[PDB]
Design a protein around this ligand. Structure first.
Ligand code: CL
Lengths: 111, 235, 250, 243, 244, 241, 195, 231, 240
């Protein structure tokens, strides 16, 4: 039987400072006991001073990030180049994830 | 007969141009934007004295920070208002924030040209959309059935529009207060209305950052009418 | 593309007339004469094989058509309209009856189905009425022999005997004088040939006349033996020779 | 009267006036031609330089279908593009199912049936283009021309647009003087000449020459644009003949 | 495109009338007269066949009176083919109701349903309306005996006595004159035939030019019987009432 | 007067669009003829290539619908090819569904039914063509069945179509009045083609070269068209007697 | 839900329905009314899968109320029961059937007779003098078979019903938290507040 | 006359009047100028107001980081067509990781507009567009007409009185094409070009709208005090 | 499907189909609505051209939408049934989803919305019907009376009339109805409603229908004799 999910490993870490924030992640990509890449970027600058990482199943993670980056682009078009606040991005990402409530993006996401 | 989406030899859509004529027959609605708020006022125009005038709802809330006045075939406005309210609250759902007045207006105007042979004809009503957001501040928009919307410092629509607009041309300046704008709407409404203006046949409203969108009581408007009469008699 | 004619092409005029139905009836009037006569032990339907060219093989063009083993049809008016109605009538006899009840429909109900199809062409969007009047002869166990006329409007009437098309007015008068309730099938065939001769100009023989009967069961035309209850079709088309034999005793 | 107001209506003549009015739009367009040669085909078109502001060699009119078919047309340019887009869908589905690239006669009928379909209903307008097209297949070279009615035939030489009569006359001479045939490189030269000679009907504005060709020997049976030295050589030959 | 040829069957006139409905009513006014009379102990349905022929097979013929179910019947005035479309729909509706509630359909509910179908053709779809007027004769245990009429507009009304088709103006005046509330079926039968005999465009009213039916509680004990009269039975009642 | 634009009845009970489709049939100014032999069915048609720029091999109004069925068309080529493609699709579908080759008369009926629909449905126009189907049917033998824009069709002993159809029709009528048989009593199809050409020459009063004619021949289990050289051989034999 | 009982006496129909509602291992409510008034003289009790019961009952209620307004007339208990049966028979072959069993107690004003109909989720209808759903009948039908007469008064019907509930309370493992009892007669529907 | 009731009807001379009437709407619209060099491409647009209380209708729309257009005619139709371009530019990026070629963007607009000119019920677009962009083959300028005709040009202008600006660019052709690596001078040439189409009114701070795209310059729009530099 | 735009703007900015729908209302029988202090009364004309009518079974002019709301109309009778059915379905749909009966204002807004939808939808014509919708909101003793019309506009009225000769009865109501002191009792409210119809009706026999709606779902229709007593008392006072 076809299993649409996989596990690409990795780990991510976000810490909020008083006037700054960090989002870290290892660059290793794996399947089972093999290494795919020793350097495969996992944390992305999505624009509007927002960084994002979707960790777990890389295919779903890349798709989510790609979709949110696209959501940012269309937010500018539709709302006169207004800056997408972090709280507004978070709520937007909730709806991106729940759109697949019955076939989930297999990722733990942090912005 | 002829297509509904047909161009005239002058390069205009017949139906859109004809809907504009219907809006000219509608009751007067005026909007004035200031740095203290935007005022919206309308002529109710009851067809009979037995008609309970307070049920005439030509000024309408879209969101806490956006209001709307209408003129023309007012029945057509109900679906536009419903769409506006839905768009405003849906954006709040998706983005956890208030929606920009311009973006709301653009969403309403996207419905306009969705007609053909979708709805069978354009809307026969014009809207004055007034509101406030953090980016562009206090704003007043005029949404037409053509799909076009202009921002205005002050605007009049309806039967006494060109006469009122000429009056708004002279009276409006960038340092107007909210109280001054209120009296100015009442003044111009009283000028273009057929019947004598009072608290029962004319309605005021405003939108401020603090209190949001508010329709004025008949008792509150009555005092502003009395305040107007005295200041006109003062010189 | 898409069929954008979703509106009726037949409508009431100020006088209450349905123009397209009337005009369809006018097309039927121009058509070649056909007739039907009901006897005590059978029904006969007949018409002229108006050949468009002598090079044309008129045998290949069948104006009298089998609808069921016990029901036959003939027309006056537009031939192509008739042909497609026969195709639909044959099919509806199976889909809306035989596949449900395991037997062929009675004459009146098959007529009712044909009538419905013709009515729908009078009201549905983007179509004209059928330009034919049908004469449907048939037999069934509980109603016996019957003859029905069906017009472009979808209206149908049962007849003892009648005629439609070119010389129908004269032909109906001729039938009124000759018809009675004690006619045998052979007498009805004889009267049919007499009536039809009046409307025909040129040659009058088995090769220019098409004639069929609804009568006794034909076990020789069944195609198989072994089932007692299956006794064969009552519809039979008369041959060219069989017609000519009856023209000598005319 | 009123028979010409709606497409797919037969006049009492038995004519479809809307299709005939579409031909008028074709006759109004710029001149385009096609020449069948020994082992292939050559296409050429007149591009009117409306203004100096037009970027030279950028507004390409000739279109490729698949990799072995060339299409050129005169009349309403968008209508031609719509027809080529369909042609590309037809060629793709043919190759998808049957593996081999679409033969030219097969391709010709695909366009023909599609154009003819737009004469069957009043809900659509006929095509405002005549299309000259062709290429090389397993059976050799083929040239076709397709009218607004859906009518098409095979051709030795073809021409359409405002300067079609002038072009046709020139094509007829080549057919008479070369019964054994014409080479691909010759056809390119002759194509240039004919467009230049046909330009006398559009002599107000100056023009830009555009040529393409499919040849078994010269292009391996693939459609290619005539560029650089070979184009200039054809322009020089054409300019020499008018003087 | 196609718009050119659209007659626009569902529009108002400047006066606020529906063109096609009015023209359909004009069609119906040329149809054979149908009369319905309601009595205390039953209902009568009488109708005139249009200029018949001697060669028409009458005993197997049905153009005016149709059975919807055991309790309800209709008289038709207009296009017979149109009427049969509606009749078959009404027959189905009655059976749907019986299957759902395990009770025979109340007369009005059936009438409203058919009238709603007619209404739809006047408001949407762009099709011509049904050129039919019905007289509904029926019985149920709520209102007892009931007469209704519907027309192409989809409007229906209840009646003690009513006519549709040709000469309704003359026929209604005659019914209004001789009708009384305490009237019985045998009297109503006589009134119906007498009214047709005076309003008819034919020279004389005969059995072969009539269809006749009664709905009686004249069935053995508390139940209702429908009687579609045969040609010989119409001939007998014509002699009995003293018309022929 | 919109009753003349679409296929609805006029007050006279006529369909003017159908009548005008018949007139479009003669727009090509080509005459066709069909006759039956003992073992074959022959169809001939005039071929006119007015433009010297045309490739004469592609100019044709005869179509190979199936292996057994051939079709000649009288009318404009776009409608002709429309009908040809549909007939090919129908002939192939028939064989797939019912397990045997579609008969000539059955295909004619099918195409005639499609044509009838265009006379009844408003959104579809009639095709301005007359279709003549020919074959050697496995049950009926040599067969000629002809369809027109009215949706009418019938079998023929022989037939002719075009502007000068009457002259050809009468010529054929007169021959069959003498011989008193429903076909050309001849063994080889070659001589049946010679008969067809000879009688078209006599009827029209024109001589033909190899490029002026177009010939289709139906035999048992195949229909085929003749080349220019095959026709030349036919014309030589005619001239030598 | 758990237990619903019904009994038809001389001049009325009495419906008794348990008050318990359980999610997981916790009894969330002990005063739940498992019934809906379909019309002034027709009451329907219900029991089955969580959520489906109320949704179905309210859907039936809406349809009958719609009928009442349209015709200005109350449908007979028999007519209502047939409508309900058809909806359940329609439901059982759906993608996701409504898992609901019902009792319909009504007083027919035309015939002046009480009527009790038992319908299960498959659409299985039966008219009965007394009825139950699920396991309720296993404990109670022996008592009803013994004590029931058709000429019983409403008070005698309640006493026999008390005996049935007492037997259930003794021999059932589940605590159903007593019952709400309602009486349907010529004057309409009323609830017995002390039971 | 009798042949202008819908887009599906040719006139006897082979004309499509509804398309020509749609073309007329562009001539009524306010003037906009487009021009390019080898490094940059520039749009200049004269915005129009309803009255003194009203704002000036926006003329320029961004489609991608490397592409955008200016409009003249029915503004809502420009919004539809620009939205379509935004989607097509975006489809190319998401699927092929490829910036959409300006020439291909023109081909897509042509085909979209064409479908509206051949079918019954619909209508032609009532707007003209000037598309600028910088892709792998350098700077580009396109002119879109709602007939479907799209044309690649060095420079052009559309709208009311556009012939004056078009003549100027036709003279200046050899000069402004050579303005490489100098955005301000290329804009100056565009502002000077659009000035040839002005009568009575002149270029004010809230009247003028400018956009630019180039080699190392994303598509950016300049309005308000940002264009006071060029007045 | 049939998509034809039947309701369209004309050069002068009018939708003729909607205006011609008002002409159908003008043709319809007169309907009147009067609200008292603690009640609303709906009066309706019955044209006496139709006798031999069965008044038991003939569709009544006033229709209950719910137990607390009623609807009368003027115009095409067949059209009114479609609005009434839709209104009744929405009333039950509201109770089912929100657990409260509709307010009179909500029900009016829905019916008005349906009428509006039929003025800008393809293939349909406007309803040739104007309605008077009256009742009392749940747990409220303030009377409610609304009017709708084909265009889809609606509004609240102290007293209103629609249909043929509505101009005359409105004239009567405008001078007779005092807002400061409305009909205090049921009698006064009915009397004023009958008086208003007597300006137009002709005979006061079976031509007048009256329906009184009181708070808490208390709706009753007056009989012929009850109405006839009002007709008698009015004219006897008039003879002076
Ligand atoms: Cl078929």
């Amino acid at each position: 039987q076809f299993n649409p999910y996989g596990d690409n490993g990795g780990t991510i870490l976000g810490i909020a400072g008083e006037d700054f924030a960090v989002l870290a992640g290892d660059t290793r990509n794996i399947t089972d006991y093999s290494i795919n890449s020793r350097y495969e970027p996992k944390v992305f600058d999505c624009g509007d001073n927002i960084v994002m990482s979707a960790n777990g199943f890389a295919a779903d993670g890349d798709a989510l990030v790609k979709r949110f980056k696209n959501s940012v682009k269309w937010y500018h078009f539709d709302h006169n180049d207004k800056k997408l606040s972090i709280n507004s991005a978070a709520r937007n990402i909730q709806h991106l994830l729940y759109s697949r409530r019955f076939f989930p993006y297999y990722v733990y996401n942090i912005i | 007969d002829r297509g509904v989406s047909t161009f005239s030899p002058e390069g205009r859509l017949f139906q859109v141009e004809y809907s504009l004529e219907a809006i000219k027959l509608g009751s007067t609605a005026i909007g004035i934007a200031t740095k203290e708020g935007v005022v919206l006022g309308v002529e109710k125009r009851a067809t009979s004295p037995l008609l309970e005038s307070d049920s005439i709802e030509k000024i309408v809330e879209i969101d806490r920070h956006i209001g709307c006045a209408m003129s023309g075939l007012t029945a057509d406005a109900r679906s536009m208002i419903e769409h506006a309210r839905t768009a405003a609250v849906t954006h709040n759902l998706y983005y956890d924030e208030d929606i920009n007045v311009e973006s709301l207006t653009q969403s309403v105007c996207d419905l306009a040209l969705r007609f053909g042979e979708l709805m069978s004809r354009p809307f026969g009503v014009a809207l004055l959309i007034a509101g406030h957001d953090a980016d562009d501040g206090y704003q007043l928009f005029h949404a037409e059935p053509s799909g076009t919307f202009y921002r205005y410092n002050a605007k009049a629509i309806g039967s006494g529009s060109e006469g009122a607009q000429a009056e708004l041309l002279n009276e409006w300046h960038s340092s107007l207060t909210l109280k001054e704008a209120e009296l100015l709407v009442l003044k111009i409404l009283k000028q273009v209305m057929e019947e004598k203006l009072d608290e029962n046949n004319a309605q005021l409203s405003c939108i401020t950052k603090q209190d949001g969108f508010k329709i004025y009581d008949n008792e509150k408007t009555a005092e502003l009418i009395k305040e107007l009469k005295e200041k006109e008699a003062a010189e | 593309m898409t069929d954008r004619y979703s509106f009726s092409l037949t409508t009431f005029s100020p006088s209450g007339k349905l123009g397209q139905i009337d005009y369809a009836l006018t097309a039927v009037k121009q058509g070649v004469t056909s007739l039907g006569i009901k006897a005590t032990n059978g029904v006969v339907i007949a018409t002229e094989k108006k050949s468009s060219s002598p090079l044309a093989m008129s045998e290949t063009l069948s104006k009298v058509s089998l609808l069921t083993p016990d029901i036959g049809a003939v027309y006056s008016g537009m031939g192509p309209d008739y042909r497609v109605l026969v195709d639909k009538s044959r099919k509806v006899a199976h889909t809306s009856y035989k596949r449900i009840y395991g037997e062929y429909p009675p004459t009146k109900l098959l007529v009712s189905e044909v009538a419905k199809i013709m009515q729908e062409a009078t009201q549905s969007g983007g179509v004209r009425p059928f330009g034919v009047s049908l004469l449907i002869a048939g037999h069934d166990e509980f109603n016996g022999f019957s003859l029905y006329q069906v017009d472009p409007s979808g209206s149908y009437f049962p007849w003892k005997a009648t005629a439609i098309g070119k010389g129908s007015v004269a032909a109906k008068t001729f039938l009124e004088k000759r018809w009675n309730d004690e006619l045998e099938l052979e007498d009805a065939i004889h009267i049919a040939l007499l009536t039809l001769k009046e409307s025909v100009e040129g040659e009058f023989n088995g090769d220019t006349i098409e004639l069929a009967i609804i009568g006794d069961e034909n076990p020789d035309l069944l195609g198989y033996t072994g089932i007692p209850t299956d006794k064969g079709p009552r519809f039979r088309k008369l041959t060219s020779q069989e017609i000519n034999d009856r023209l000598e005793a005319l | 009267t009123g028979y010409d107001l709606s497409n797919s209506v037969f006049s009492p003549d038995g004519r479809n006036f809307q299709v005939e009015y579409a031909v008028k739009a074709v006759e109004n367009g710029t001149t385009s031609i096609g020449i069948k040669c020994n082992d292939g085909v050559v296409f050429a078109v007149e591009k009117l330089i409306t203004s100096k502001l037009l970027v030279p060699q950028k507004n390409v009119k000739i279109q490729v279908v698949d990799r072995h078919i060339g299409c050129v047309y005169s009349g309403l340019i968008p209508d031609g593009r719509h027809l080529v887009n369909r042609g590309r869908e037809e060629a793709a589905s043919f190759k998808k199912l049957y593996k081999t690239p679409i033969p030219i006669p097969a391709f010709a009928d695909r366009l023909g049936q599609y154009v003819q379909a737009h004469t069957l209903y009043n809900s659509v307008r006929p095509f405002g283009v005549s299309t000259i097209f062709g290429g090389v297949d397993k059976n050799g070279a083929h040239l076709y021309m397709l009218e607004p009615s859906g009518s098409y035939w095979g051709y030795k030489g073809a021409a359409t647009g405002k300067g079609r009569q002038s072009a046709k006359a020139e094509l007829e001479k080549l057919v008479d003087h070369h019964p054994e045939g014409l080479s691909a490189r010759e056809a390119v030269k002759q194509a240039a000449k004919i467009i230049y000679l046909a330009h006398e009907d559009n002599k107000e504005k100056d023009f830009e020459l555009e040529i393409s060709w499919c040849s078994l020997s010269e292009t391996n049976g693939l459609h290619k644009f005539v560029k650089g030295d070979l184009l200039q050589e054809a322009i020089d030959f054409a300019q020499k003949e008018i003087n | 495109g196609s718009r050119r040829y659209d007659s626009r069957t569902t529009i108002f006139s400047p006066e606020g009338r529906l063109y096609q409905v009015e023209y359909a009513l004009e069609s119906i006014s040329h149809a054979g007269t149908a009369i319905g009379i309601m009595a205390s102990d039953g209902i009568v349905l009488a109708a005139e066949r249009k200029v018949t022929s001697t060669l028409l097979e009458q005993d197997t013929s049905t153009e005016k009176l149709y059975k919807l179910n055991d309790k309800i019947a209709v008289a038709v005035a207009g296009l017979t083919a149109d009427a049969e479309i509606l009749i078959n729909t009404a027959r189905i509706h009655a059976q749907n109701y019986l299957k759902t509630y395990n009770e025979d359909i109340p007369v009005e509910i059936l009438v409203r349903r058919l009238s709603d179908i007619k209404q739809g053709y006047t408001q949407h779809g762009g099709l011509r309306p049904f050129g039919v007027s019905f007289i509904y004769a029926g019985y149920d245990d709520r209102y007892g005996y009931q007469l209704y009429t519907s027309n192409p507009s989809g409007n229906y009304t209840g009646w003690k006595a009513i006519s549709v088709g040709a000469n309704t103006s003359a026929a209604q005046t005659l019914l209004q004159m001789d009708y009384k509330d305490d009237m019985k079926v045998d009297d109503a039968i006589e009134l119906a035939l007498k009214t047709l005999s005076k309003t008819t465009d034919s020279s004389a009213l005969t059995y072969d030019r009539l269809e006749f039916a009664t709905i009686r509680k004249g069935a053995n004990d508390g139940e209702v019987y429908q009687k579609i009269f045969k040609p010989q039975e119409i001939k007998d009642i014509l002699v009995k009432t003293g018309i022929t | 007067g919109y009753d003349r634009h679409i296929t609805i009845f006029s007050p006279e009970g006529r369909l003017y669009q159908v009548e005008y489709a018949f007139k479009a049939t003669n727009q090509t100014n080509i005459n066709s003829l069909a006759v039956r032999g003992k073992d074959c069915t022959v169809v001939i048609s005039q071929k006119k290539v007015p433009d010297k720029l045309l490739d004469p091999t592609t100019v044709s109004y005869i179509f190979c619908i199936s292996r057994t069925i051939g079709m000649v068309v009288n009318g404009p080529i776009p409608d002709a090819r429309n009908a040809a493609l549909r007939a090919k699709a129908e002939a192939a579908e028939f064989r797939y569904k019912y397990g045997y080759d579609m008969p000539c008369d059955v295909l004619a009926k099918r195409m005639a039914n499609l044509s009838q629909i265009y006379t009844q449905r408003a959104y579809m126009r009639p095709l301005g063509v007359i279709l003549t189907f020919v074959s050697v049917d496995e049950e009926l033998g040599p067969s000629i069945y002809k369809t027109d824009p009215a949706g009418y069709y019938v079998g023929y002993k022989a037939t002719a179509t075009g502007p000068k159809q009457q002259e050809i029709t009468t010529n054929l009528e007169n021959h069959f009045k003498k011989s008193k048989i429903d076909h050309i009593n001849e063994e080889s199809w070659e001589k049946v083609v010679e008969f067809a050409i000879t009688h078209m020459i006599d009827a029209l009063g024109t001589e033909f070269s190899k490029n002026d004619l177009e010939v289709g021949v139906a035999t048992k289990d195949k229909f085929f068209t003749l080349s220019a050289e095959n026709i030349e051989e036919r014309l030589v034999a005619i001239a030598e007697q | 839900m758990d237990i619903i009982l019904g009994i038809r006496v001389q001049d009325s129909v009495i419906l008794a329905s348990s008050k318990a509602v359980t999610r997981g291992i916790s009894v969330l409510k002990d005063s739940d009314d498992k019934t809906r008034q379909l019309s002034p003289h027709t009451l329907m009790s219900f029991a089955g899968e969580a959520g489906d019961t109320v949704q179905f009952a309210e859907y039936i209620q809406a349809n009958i109320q719609l009928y009442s307004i349209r015709e200005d007339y109350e449908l007979s208990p028999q007519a209502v029961s047939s409508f309900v049966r058809q909806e359940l028979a329609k439901s059982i072959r759906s993608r996701r059937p409504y898992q609901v069993n019902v009792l319909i107690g009504g007083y027919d004003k035309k015939k002046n007779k009480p009527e009790l109909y038992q319908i299960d989720y498959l659409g299985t209808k039966v008219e009965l003098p007394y009825g139950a759903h699920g396991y309720s009948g296993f404990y109670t039908f022996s008592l009803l078979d013994h004590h029931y007469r058709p000429d019983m008064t409403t008070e005698e019907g309640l006493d026999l019903l008390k005996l049935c509930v007492q037997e259930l309370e003794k021999r059932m493992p589940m605590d159903f938290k007593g019952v709400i009892v309602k009486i349907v007669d010529k004057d309409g529907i009323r609830q017995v507040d002390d039971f | 006359n009798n042949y202008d009731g819908d887009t599906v009807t040719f006139s006897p001379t082979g004309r499509l009047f509804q398309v020509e009437y749609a073309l007329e709407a562009i001539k009524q619209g306010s003037v906009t100028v487009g021009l390019r060099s080898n490094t940059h491409a520039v749009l200049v647009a004269l915005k129009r107001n309803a009255d003194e209380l009203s704002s000036y209708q926006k003329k320029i729309i961004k489609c991608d980081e490397h592409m955008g257009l200016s409009l003249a005619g029915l503004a809502p139709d420009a919004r539809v067509l620009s939205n379509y371009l935004r989607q097509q530019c975006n489809y190319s990026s998401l699927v092929f990781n490829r910036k959409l070629a300006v020439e291909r963007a023109g081909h897509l607009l042509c085909d979209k507009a064409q479908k509206n000119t051949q079918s019954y019920g619909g209508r032609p677009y009532g707007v003209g567009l000037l598309i600028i962009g910088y892709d792998k083959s350098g700077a580009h300028l396109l002119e879109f007409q709602p007939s479907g005709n799209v044309t690649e040009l060095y420079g052009t202008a559309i709208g009311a009185r556009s012939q004056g600006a078009k003549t100027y660019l036709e003279r200046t052709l050899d000069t402004f094409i050579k303005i490489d690596g100098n955005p301000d001078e290329l804009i100056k040439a565009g502002v000077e070009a659009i000035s040839q189409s002005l009568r009575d009114e002149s270029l004010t701070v809230d009247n003028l709208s400018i956009a630019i795209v180039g080699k190392d310059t994303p598509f950016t729009i300049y309005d308000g005090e940002a264009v006071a530099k060029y007045i | 499907g049939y998509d034809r735009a039947l309701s369209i703007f004309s050069p002068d900015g009018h939708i003729f189909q909607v205006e011609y729908a008002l002409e159908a209302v003008k043709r319809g029988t007169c309907a009147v609505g009067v609200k008292g202090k603690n009640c609303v009364v709906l009066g309706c004309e019955r044209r006496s051209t139709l006798k031999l009518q069965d008044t038991r079974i003939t569709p009544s002019k006033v229709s209950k939408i719910d137990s607390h709301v009623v609807l009368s109309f003027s115009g095409l009778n067949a059209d009114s049934r479609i609005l009434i059915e839709k209104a009744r379905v929405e009333a039950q749909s509201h109770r089912l989803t929100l657990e409260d009966p509709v307010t009179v204002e909500y029900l009016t807004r829905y019916v008005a919305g349906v009428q509006q939808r039929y003025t800008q939808s393809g293939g349909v014509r406007p309803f040739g019907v104007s309605t008077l919708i009256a009742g009392f909101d749940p747990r409220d003793d303030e009377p409610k009376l609304y009017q709708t019309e084909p265009s889809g506009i609606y509004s609240s009225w102290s007293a209103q009339t629609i249909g043929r000769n509505s101009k005359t009865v409105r004239e009567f109501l405008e001078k007779n109805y005092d807002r400061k002191e409305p009909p205090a009792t049921v009698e006064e409210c009915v009397k004023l409603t009958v008086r208003s119809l007597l300006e137009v009706v002709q005979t006061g026999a079976k031509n007048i229908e009256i329906t009184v709606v009181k708070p808490d779902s208390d709706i009753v229709a007056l009989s012929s004799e009850e109405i006839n007593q009002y007709v008698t008392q009015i004219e006897q006072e008039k003879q002076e």
